[PDB]
PDB file of C-alpha atoms and ligand atoms in Angstrom:
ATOM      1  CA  UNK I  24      -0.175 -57.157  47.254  1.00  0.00           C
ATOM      2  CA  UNK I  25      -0.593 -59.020  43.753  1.00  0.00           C
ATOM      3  CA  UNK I  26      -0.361 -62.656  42.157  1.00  0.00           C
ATOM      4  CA  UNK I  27       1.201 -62.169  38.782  1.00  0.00           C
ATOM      5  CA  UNK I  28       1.011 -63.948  36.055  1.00  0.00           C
ATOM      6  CA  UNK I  29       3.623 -63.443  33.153  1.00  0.00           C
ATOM      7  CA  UNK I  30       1.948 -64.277  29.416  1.00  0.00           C
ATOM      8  CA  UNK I  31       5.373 -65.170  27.752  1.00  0.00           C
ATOM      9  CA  UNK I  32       5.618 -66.788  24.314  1.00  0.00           C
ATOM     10  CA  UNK I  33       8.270 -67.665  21.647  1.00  0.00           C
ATOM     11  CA  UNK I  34       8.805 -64.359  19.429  1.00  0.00           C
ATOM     12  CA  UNK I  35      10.993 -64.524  16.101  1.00  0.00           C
ATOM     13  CA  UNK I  36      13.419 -61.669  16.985  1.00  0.00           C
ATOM     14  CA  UNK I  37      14.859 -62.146  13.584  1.00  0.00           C
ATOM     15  CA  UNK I  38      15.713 -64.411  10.911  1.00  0.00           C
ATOM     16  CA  UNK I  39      18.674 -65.822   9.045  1.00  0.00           C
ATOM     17  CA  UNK I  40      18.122 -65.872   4.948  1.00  0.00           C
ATOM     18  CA  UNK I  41      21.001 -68.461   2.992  1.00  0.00           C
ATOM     19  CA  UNK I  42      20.218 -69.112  -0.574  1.00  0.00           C
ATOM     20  CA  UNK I  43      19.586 -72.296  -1.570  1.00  0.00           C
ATOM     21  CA  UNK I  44      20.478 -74.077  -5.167  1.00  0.00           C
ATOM     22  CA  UNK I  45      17.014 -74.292  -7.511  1.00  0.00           C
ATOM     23  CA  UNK I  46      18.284 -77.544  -8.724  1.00  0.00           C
ATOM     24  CA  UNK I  47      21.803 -79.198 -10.267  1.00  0.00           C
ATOM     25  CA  UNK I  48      22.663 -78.971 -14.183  1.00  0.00           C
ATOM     26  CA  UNK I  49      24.352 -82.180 -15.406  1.00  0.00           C
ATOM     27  CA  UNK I  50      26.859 -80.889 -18.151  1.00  0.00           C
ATOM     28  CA  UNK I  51      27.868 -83.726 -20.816  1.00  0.00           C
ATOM     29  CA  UNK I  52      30.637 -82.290 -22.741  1.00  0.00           C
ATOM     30  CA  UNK I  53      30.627 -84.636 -25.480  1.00  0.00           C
ATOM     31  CA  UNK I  54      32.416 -83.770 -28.922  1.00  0.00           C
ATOM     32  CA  UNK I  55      32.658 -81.167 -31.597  1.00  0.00           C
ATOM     33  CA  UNK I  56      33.009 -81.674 -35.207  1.00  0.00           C
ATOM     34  CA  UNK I  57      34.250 -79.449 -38.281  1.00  0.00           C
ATOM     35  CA  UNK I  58      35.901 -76.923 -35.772  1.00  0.00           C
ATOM     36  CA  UNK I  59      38.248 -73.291 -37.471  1.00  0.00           C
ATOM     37  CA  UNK I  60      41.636 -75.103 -38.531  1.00  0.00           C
ATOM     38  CA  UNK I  61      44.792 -72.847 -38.600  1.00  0.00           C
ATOM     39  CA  UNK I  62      45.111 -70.524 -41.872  1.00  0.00           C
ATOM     40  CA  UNK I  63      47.659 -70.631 -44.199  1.00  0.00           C
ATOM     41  CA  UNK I  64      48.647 -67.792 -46.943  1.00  0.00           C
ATOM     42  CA  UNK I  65      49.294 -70.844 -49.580  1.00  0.00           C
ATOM     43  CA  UNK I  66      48.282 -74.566 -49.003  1.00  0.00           C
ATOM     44  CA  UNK I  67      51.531 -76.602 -48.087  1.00  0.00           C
ATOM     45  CA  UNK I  68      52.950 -79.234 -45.881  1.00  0.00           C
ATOM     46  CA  UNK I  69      51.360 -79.739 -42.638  1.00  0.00           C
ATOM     47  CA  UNK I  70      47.810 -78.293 -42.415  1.00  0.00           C
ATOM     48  CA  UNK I  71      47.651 -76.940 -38.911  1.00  0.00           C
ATOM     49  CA  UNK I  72      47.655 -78.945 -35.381  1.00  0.00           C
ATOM     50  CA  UNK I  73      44.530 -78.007 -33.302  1.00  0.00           C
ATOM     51  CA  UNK I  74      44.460 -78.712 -30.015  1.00  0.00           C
ATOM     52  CA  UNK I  75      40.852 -78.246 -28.942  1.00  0.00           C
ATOM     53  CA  UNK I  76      39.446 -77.874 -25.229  1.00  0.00           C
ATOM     54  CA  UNK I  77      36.854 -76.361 -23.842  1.00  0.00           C
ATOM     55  CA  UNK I  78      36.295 -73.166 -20.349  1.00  0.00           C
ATOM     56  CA  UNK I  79      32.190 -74.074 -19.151  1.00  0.00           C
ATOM     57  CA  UNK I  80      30.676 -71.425 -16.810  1.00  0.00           C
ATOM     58  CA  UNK I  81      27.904 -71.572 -14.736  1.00  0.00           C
ATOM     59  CA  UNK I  82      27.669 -68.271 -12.179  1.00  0.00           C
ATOM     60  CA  UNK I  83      30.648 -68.456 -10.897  1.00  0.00           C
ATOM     61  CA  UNK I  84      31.866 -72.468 -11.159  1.00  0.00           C
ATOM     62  CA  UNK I  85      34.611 -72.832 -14.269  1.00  0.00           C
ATOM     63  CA  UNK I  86      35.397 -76.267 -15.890  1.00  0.00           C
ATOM     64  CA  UNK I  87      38.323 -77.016 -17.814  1.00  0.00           C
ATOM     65  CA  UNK I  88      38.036 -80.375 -19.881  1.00  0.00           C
ATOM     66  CA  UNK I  89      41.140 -82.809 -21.526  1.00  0.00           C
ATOM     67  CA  UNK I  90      43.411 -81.311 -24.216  1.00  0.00           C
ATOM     68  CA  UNK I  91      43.073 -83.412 -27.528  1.00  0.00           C
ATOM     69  CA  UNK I  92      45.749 -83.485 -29.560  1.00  0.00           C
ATOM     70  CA  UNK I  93      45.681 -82.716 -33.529  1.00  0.00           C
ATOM     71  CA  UNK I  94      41.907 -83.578 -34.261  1.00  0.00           C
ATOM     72  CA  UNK I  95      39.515 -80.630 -35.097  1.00  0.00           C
ATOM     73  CA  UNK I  96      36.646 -83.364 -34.358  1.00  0.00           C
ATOM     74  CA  UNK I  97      37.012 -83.187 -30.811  1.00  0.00           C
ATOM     75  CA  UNK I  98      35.843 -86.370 -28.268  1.00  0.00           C
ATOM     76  CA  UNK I  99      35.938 -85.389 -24.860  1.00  0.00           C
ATOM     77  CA  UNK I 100      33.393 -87.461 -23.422  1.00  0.00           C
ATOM     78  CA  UNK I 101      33.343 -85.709 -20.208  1.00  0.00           C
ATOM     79  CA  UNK I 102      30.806 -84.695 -17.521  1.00  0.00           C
ATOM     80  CA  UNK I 103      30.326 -81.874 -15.042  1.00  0.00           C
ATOM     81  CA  UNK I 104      27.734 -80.815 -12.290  1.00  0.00           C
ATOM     82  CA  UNK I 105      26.942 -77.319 -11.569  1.00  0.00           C
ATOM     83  CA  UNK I 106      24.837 -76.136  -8.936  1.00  0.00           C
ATOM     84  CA  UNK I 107      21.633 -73.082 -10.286  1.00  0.00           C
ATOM     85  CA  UNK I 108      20.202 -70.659  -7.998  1.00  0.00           C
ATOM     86  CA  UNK I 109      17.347 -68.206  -8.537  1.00  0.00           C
ATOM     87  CA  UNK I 110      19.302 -65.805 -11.284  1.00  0.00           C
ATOM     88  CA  UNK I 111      16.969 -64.350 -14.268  1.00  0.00           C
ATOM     89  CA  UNK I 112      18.881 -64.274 -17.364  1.00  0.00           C
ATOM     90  CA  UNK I 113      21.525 -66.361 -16.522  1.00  0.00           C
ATOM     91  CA  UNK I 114      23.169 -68.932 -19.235  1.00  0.00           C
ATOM     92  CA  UNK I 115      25.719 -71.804 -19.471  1.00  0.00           C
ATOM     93  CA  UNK I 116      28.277 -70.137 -20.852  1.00  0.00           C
ATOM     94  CA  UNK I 117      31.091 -72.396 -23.190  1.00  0.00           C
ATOM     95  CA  UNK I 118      34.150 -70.901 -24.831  1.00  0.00           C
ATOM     96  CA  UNK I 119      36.277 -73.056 -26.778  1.00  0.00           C
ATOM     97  CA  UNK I 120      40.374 -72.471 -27.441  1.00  0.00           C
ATOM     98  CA  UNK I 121      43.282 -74.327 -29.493  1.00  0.00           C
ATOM     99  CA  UNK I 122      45.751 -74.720 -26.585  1.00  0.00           C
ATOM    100  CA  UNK I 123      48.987 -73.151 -28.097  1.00  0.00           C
ATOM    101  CA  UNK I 124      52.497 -72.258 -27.293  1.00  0.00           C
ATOM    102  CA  UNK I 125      51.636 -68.838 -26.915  1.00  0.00           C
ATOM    103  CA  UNK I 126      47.594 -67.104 -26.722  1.00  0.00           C
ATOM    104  CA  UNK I 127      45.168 -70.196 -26.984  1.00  0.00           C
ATOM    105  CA  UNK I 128      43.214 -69.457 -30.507  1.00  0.00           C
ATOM    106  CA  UNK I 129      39.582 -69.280 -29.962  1.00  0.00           C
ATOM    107  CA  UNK I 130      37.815 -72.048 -31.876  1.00  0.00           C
ATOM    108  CA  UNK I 131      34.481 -70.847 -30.813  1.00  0.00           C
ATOM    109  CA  UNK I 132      31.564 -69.562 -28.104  1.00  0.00           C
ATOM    110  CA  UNK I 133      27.914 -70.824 -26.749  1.00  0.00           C
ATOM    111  CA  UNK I 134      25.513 -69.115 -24.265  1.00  0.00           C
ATOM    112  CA  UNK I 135      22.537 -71.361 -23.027  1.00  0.00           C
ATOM    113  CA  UNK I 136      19.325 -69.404 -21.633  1.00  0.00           C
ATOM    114  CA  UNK I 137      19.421 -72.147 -18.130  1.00  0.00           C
ATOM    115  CA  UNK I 138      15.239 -71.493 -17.553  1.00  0.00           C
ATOM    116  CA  UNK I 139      15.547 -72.720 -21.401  1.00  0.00           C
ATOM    117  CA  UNK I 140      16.975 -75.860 -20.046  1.00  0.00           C
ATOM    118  CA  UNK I 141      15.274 -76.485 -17.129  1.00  0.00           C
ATOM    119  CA  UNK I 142      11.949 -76.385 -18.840  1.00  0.00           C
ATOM    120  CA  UNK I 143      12.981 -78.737 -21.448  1.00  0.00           C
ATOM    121  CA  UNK I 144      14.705 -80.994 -18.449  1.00  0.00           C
ATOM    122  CA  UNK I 145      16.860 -82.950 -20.685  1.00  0.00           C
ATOM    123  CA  UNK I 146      18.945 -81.802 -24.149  1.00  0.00           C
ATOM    124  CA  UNK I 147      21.053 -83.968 -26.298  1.00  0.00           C
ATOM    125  CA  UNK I 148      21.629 -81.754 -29.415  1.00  0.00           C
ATOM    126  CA  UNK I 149      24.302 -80.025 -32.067  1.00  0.00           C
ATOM    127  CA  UNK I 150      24.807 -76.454 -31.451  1.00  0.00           C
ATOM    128  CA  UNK I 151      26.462 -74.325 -33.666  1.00  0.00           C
ATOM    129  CA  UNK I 152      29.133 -71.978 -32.645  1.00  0.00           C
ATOM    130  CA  UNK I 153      29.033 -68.449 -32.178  1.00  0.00           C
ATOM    131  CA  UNK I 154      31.814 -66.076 -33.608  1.00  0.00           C
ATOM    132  CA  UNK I 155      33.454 -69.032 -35.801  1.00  0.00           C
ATOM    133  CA  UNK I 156      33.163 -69.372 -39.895  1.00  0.00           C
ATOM    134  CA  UNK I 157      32.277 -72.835 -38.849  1.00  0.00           C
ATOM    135  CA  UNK I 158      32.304 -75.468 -36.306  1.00  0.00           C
ATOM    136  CA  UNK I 159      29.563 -77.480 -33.911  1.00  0.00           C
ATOM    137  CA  UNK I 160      29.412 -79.012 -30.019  1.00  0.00           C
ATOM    138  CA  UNK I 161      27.670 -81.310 -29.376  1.00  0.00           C
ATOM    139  CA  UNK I 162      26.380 -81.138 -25.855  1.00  0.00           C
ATOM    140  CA  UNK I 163      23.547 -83.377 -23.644  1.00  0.00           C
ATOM    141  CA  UNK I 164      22.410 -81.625 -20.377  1.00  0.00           C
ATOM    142  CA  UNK I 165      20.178 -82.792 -17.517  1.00  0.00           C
ATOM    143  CA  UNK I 166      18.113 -80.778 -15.067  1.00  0.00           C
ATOM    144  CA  UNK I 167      18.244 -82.276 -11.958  1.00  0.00           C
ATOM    145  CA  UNK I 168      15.951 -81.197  -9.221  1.00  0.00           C
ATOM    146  CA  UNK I 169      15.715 -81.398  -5.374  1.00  0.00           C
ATOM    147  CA  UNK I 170      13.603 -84.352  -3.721  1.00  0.00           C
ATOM    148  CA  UNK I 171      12.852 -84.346  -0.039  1.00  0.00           C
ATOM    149  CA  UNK I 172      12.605 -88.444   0.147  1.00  0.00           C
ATOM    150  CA  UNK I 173      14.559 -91.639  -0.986  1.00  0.00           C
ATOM    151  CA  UNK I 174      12.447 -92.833  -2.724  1.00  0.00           C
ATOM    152  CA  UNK I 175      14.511 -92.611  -6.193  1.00  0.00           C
ATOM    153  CA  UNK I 176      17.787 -93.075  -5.175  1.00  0.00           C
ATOM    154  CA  UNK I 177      18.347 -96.463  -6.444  1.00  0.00           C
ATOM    155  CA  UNK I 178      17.994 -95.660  -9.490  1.00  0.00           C
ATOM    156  CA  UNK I 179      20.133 -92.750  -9.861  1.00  0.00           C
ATOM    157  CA  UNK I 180      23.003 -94.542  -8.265  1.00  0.00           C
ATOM    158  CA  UNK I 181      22.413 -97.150 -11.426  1.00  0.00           C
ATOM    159  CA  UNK I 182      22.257 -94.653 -13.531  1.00  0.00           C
ATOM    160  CA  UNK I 183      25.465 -92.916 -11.784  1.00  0.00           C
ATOM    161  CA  UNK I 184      27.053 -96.537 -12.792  1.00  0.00           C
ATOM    162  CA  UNK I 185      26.084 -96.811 -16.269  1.00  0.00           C
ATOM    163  CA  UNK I 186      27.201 -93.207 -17.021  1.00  0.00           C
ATOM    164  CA  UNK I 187      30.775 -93.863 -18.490  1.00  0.00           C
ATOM    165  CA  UNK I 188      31.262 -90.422 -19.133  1.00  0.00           C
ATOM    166  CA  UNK I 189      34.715 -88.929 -17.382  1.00  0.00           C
ATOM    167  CA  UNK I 190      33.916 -87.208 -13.962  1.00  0.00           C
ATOM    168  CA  UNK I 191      37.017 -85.614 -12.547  1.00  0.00           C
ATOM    169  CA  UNK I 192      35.322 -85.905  -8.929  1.00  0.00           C
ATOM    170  CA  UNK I 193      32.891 -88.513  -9.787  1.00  0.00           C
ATOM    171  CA  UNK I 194      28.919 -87.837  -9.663  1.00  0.00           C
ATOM    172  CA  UNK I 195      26.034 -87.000  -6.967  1.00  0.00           C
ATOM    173  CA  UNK I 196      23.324 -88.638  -6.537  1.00  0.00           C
ATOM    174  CA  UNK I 197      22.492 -85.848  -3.646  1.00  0.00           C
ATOM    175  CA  UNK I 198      23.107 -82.609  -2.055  1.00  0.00           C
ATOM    176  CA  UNK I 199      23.870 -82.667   1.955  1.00  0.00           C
ATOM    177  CA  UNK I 200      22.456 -79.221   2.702  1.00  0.00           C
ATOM    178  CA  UNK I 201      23.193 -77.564   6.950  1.00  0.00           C
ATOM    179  CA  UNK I 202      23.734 -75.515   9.319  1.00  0.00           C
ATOM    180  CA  UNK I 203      26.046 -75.032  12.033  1.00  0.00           C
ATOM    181  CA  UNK I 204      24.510 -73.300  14.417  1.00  0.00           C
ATOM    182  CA  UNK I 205      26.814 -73.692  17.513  1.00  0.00           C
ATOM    183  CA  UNK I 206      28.616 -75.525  20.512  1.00  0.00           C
ATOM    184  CA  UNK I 207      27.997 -75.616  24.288  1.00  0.00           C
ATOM    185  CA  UNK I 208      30.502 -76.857  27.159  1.00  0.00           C
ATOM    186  CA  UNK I 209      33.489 -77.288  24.606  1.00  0.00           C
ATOM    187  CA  UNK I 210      36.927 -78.489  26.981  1.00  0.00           C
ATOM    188  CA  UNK I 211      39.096 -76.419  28.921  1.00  0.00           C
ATOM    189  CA  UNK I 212      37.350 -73.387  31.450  1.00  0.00           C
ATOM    190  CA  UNK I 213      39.480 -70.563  27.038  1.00  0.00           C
ATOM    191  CA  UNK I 214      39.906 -72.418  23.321  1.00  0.00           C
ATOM    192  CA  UNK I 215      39.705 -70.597  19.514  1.00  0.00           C
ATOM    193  CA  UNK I 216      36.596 -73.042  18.089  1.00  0.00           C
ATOM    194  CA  UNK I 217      36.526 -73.680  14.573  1.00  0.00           C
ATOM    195  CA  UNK I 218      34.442 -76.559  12.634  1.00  0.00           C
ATOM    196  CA  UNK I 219      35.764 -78.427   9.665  1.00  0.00           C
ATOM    197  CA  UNK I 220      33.061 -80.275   7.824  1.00  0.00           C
ATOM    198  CA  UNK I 221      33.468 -83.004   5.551  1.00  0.00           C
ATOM    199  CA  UNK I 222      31.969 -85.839   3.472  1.00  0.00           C
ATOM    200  CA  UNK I 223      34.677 -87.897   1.915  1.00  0.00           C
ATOM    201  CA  UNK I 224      37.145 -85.685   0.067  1.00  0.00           C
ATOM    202  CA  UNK I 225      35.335 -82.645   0.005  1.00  0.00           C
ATOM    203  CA  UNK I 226      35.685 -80.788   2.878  1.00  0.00           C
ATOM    204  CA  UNK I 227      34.492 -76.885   3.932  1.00  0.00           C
ATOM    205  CA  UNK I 228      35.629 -74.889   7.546  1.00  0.00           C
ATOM    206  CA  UNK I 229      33.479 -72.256   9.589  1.00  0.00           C
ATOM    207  CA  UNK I 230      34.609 -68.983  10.840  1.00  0.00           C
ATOM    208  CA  UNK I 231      37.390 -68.811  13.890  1.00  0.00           C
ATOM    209  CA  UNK I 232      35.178 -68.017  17.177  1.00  0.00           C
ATOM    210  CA  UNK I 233      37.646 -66.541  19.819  1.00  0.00           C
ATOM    211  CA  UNK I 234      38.214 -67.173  23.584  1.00  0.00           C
ATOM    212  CA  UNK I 235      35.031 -69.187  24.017  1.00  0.00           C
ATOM    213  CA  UNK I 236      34.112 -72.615  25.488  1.00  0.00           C
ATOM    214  CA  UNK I 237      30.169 -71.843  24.006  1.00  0.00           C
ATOM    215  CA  UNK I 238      31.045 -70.567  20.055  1.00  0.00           C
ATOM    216  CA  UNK I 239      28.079 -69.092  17.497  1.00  0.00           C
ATOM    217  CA  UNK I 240      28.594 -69.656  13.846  1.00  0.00           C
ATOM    218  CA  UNK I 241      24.745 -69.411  12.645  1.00  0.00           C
ATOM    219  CA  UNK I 242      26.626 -70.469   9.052  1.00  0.00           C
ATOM    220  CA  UNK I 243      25.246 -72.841   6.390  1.00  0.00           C
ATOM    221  CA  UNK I 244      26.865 -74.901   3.967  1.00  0.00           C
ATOM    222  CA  UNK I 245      26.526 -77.117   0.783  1.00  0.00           C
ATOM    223  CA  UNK I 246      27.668 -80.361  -0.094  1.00  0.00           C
ATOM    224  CA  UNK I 247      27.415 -82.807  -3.187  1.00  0.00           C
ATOM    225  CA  UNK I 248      27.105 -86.415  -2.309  1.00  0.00           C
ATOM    226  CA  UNK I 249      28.014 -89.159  -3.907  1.00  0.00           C
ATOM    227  CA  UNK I 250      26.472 -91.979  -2.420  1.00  0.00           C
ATOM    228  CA  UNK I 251      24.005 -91.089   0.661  1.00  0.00           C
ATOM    229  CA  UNK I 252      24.031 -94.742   1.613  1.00  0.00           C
ATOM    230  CA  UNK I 253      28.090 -95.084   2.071  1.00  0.00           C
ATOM    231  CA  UNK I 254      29.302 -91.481   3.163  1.00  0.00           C
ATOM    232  CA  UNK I 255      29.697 -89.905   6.369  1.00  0.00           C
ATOM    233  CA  UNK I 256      29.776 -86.323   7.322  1.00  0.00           C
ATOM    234  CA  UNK I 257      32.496 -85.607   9.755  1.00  0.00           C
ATOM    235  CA  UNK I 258      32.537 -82.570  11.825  1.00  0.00           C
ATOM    236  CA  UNK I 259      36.121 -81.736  13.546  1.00  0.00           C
ATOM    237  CA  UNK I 260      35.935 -79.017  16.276  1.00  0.00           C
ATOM    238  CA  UNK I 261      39.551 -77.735  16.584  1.00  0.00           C
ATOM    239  CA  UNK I 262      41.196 -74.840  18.687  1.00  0.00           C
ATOM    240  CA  UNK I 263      42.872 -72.806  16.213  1.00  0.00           C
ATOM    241  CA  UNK I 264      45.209 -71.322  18.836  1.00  0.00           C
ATOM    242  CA  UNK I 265      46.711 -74.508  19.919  1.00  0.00           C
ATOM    243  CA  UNK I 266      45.773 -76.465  16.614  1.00  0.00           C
ATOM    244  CA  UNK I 267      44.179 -79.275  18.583  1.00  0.00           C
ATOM    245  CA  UNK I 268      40.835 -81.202  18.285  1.00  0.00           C
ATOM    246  CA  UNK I 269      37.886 -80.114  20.735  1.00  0.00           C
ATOM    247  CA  UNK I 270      35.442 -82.764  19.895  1.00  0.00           C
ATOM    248  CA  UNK I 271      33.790 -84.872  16.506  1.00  0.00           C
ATOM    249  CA  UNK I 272      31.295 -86.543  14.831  1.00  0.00           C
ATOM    250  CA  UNK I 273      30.373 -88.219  12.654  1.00  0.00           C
ATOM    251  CA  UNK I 274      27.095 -88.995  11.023  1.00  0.00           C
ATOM    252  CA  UNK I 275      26.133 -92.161   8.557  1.00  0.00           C
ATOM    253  CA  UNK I 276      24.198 -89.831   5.895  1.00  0.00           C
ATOM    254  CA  UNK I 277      22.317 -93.115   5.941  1.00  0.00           C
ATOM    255  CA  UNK I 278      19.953 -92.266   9.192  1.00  0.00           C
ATOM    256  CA  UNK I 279      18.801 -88.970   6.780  1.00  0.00           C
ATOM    257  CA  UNK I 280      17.305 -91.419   4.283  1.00  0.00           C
ATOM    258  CA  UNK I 281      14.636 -92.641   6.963  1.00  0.00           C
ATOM    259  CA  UNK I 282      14.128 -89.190   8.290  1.00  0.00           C
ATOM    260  CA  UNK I 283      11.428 -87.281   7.807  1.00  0.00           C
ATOM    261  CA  UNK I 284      11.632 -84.647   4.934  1.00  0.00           C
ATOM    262  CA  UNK I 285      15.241 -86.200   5.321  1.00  0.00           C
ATOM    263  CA  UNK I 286      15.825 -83.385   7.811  1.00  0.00           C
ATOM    264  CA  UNK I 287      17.284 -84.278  11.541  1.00  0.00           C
ATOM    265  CA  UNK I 288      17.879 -80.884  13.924  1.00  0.00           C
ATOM    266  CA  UNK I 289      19.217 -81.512  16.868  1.00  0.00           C
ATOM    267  CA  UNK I 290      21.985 -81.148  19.499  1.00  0.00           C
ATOM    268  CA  UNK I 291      24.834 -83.487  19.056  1.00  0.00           C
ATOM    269  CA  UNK I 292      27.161 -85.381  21.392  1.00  0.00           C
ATOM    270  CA  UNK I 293      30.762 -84.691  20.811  1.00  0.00           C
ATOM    271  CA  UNK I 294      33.132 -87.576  20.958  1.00  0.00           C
ATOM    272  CA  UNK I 295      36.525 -87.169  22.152  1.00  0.00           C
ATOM    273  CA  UNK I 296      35.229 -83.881  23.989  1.00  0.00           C
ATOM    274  CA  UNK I 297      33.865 -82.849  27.376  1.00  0.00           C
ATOM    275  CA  UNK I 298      31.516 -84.471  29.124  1.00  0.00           C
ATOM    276  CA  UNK I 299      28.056 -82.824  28.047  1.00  0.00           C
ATOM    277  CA  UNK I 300      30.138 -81.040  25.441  1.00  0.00           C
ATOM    278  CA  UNK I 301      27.994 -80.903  22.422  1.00  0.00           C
ATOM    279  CA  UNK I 302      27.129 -79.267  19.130  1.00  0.00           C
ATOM    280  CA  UNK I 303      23.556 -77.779  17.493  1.00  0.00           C
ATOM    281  CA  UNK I 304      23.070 -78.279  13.882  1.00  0.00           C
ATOM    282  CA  UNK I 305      20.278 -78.898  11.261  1.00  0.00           C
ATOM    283  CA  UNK I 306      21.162 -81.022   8.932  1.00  0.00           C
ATOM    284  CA  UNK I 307      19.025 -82.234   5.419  1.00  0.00           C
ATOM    285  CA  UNK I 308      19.302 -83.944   2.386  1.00  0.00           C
ATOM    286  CA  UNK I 309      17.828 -83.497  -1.002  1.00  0.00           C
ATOM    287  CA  UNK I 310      18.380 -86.520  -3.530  1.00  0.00           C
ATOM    288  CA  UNK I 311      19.129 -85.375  -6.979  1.00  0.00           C
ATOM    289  CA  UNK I 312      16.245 -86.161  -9.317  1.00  0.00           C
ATOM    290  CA  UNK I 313      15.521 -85.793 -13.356  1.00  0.00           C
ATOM    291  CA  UNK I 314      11.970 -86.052 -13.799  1.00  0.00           C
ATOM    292  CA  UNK I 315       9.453 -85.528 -16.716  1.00  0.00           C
TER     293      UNK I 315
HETATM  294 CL1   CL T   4      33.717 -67.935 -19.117  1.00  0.00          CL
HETATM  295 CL1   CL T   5      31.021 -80.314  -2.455  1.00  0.00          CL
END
C-alpha cells in the first residue's frame, strides 16, 4: 500500500526553427544616364533606338521595371521592397537590357554588398556600370528594420504618401509575421482541411491535411502590410475534397497595434463553423522602420 505522488512538468520535446527576414530593403530604381547606344560600322541616319529596363535580384525575389522607349537616359522612377535574411555575402544584384526584337542587348550590371547597405541605412548615389564602355544608375535604397511597437507608424504611412515613386503593389509600412498551428472540432464527424490566409490581395494556402475533423499544419508564413490600421487578415478553412468552407476569421490587424510586443497567441473562434470549432495560431507584427 502507497500514496503516490507524480512530479510532472512541461518538457520541450522539440522545437520548430522558421527563418525570419533581418529587415526589408526599399529599392528606388530611379534613372540612368549616358547608357552603350547601338554601334554602327559608319555614322548614318538613325543612331540606334534603346529601349532600356532593368532585372533587380535580391535571393531569390526578381523585379522587372517599365520599358522606355528611345532614350539612353533612362527615368523609371520606380520602387520595390525586398525582404533580407541572415545570408553572408549576399548582394543586390541589377542587370540592365535594351528590350529588342530578338536577344535583349545588355546595357550593363551592378552587385551591391547588402551588410554594405544596411550599415550605411540609407544610399542615394550614381553607380557606375559594370561590363559597359560607359553608362551610370542612379539608385536610392533604404534599410528598413523590424520594430516590435507602433509607436512609428504614423509617420511611415506619411512618408508611404509622399513617396510618388511607382509601386506595382503599393508599399508596407509592416510585416504580418504567423503561424498556423492547427484546428480542433472542425464540422462534419471526415473533411480534407486546408487554410487560405490573406490580407487584402495577397493571399498564401497551407498544406492539404486529410480525413480529419482536428488538422496539424505547425507552418509559418509572411506577409507585407500595407496599412496595419485598415487591413484584415482573413483565414478561410476549406475542405479540399468537397471544395467547401469549414469555418473563418477574420482579424482587424488593428487589435496587434495595442498588443503587447504586437504578438496575440491564442485559440480562435471559427465563424460559420461548428459549435466550439476553433483554430490555434500566433500571430505578430513588426512595423517597418528606417532609423539612424
Ligand atoms: Cl539576376
Ligand atoms: Cl505578401
Amino acid at each position: 500500500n502507497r500514496i503516490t505522488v507524480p512530479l510532472v512538468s512541461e518538457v520541450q520535446i522539440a522545437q520548430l526553427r522558421f527563418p525570419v527576414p533581418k529587415g526589408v530593403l526599399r529599392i528606388h530604381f530611379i534613372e540612368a544616364q549616358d547608357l552603350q547606344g547601338k554601334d554602327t560600322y559608319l555614322k548614318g541616319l538613325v543612331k540606334g533606338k534603346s529601349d532600356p529596363y532593368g532585372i533587380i535580384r535580391v535571393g531569390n525575389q526578381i523585379f522587372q521595371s517599365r520599358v522606355i522607349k528611345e532614350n539612353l537616359s533612362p527615368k523609371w522612377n520606380e520602387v520595390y521592397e525586398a525582404l533580407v535574411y541572415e545570408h553572408p555575402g549576399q548582394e543586390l544584384e541589377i542587370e540592365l537590357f535594351d528590350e529588342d526584337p530578338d536577344k535583349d542587348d545588355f546595357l550593363g550590371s551592378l552587385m551591391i554588398d547588402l551588410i554594405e547597405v544596411e550599415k550605411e541605412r540609407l544610399l542615394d548615389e550614381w553607380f557606375t556600370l559594370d561590363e559597359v564602355p560607359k553608362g551610370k544608375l542612379h539608385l536610392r535604397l533604404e534599410w528598413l528594420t523590424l520594430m516590435p511597437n507602433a509607436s512609428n507608424l504614423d509617420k511611415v504611412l506619411t512618408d508611404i504618401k509622399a513617396d510618388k515613386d511607382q509601386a506595382n503593389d503599393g508599399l508596407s509600412s509592416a510585416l504580418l509575421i504567423l503561424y498556423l498551428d492547427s484546428a480542433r472540432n472542425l464540422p462534419s464527424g471526415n473533411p480534407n482541411p486546408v487554410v487560405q490566409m490573406s490580407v487584402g490581395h495577397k493571399a498564401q494556402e497551407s498544406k492539404i491535411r486529410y480525413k480529419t475533423n482536428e488538422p496539424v499544419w505547425e507552418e509559418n508564413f509572411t506577409f507585407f502590410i500595407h496599412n496595419p490600421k485598415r487591413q484584415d487578415l482573413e483565414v478561410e478553412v476549406r475542405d479540399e475534397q468537397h471544395q467547401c468552407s469549414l469555418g473563418n476569421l477574420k482579424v482587424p490587424l488593428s487589435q496587434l497595434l495595442t498588443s503587447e510586443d504586437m504578438t496575440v497567441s491564442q485559440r480562435f473562434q471559427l465563424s460559420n463553423s461548428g459549435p466550439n470549432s476553433t483554430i490555434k495560431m500566433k500571430i505578430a507584427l513588426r512595423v517597418l522602420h528606417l532609423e539612424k
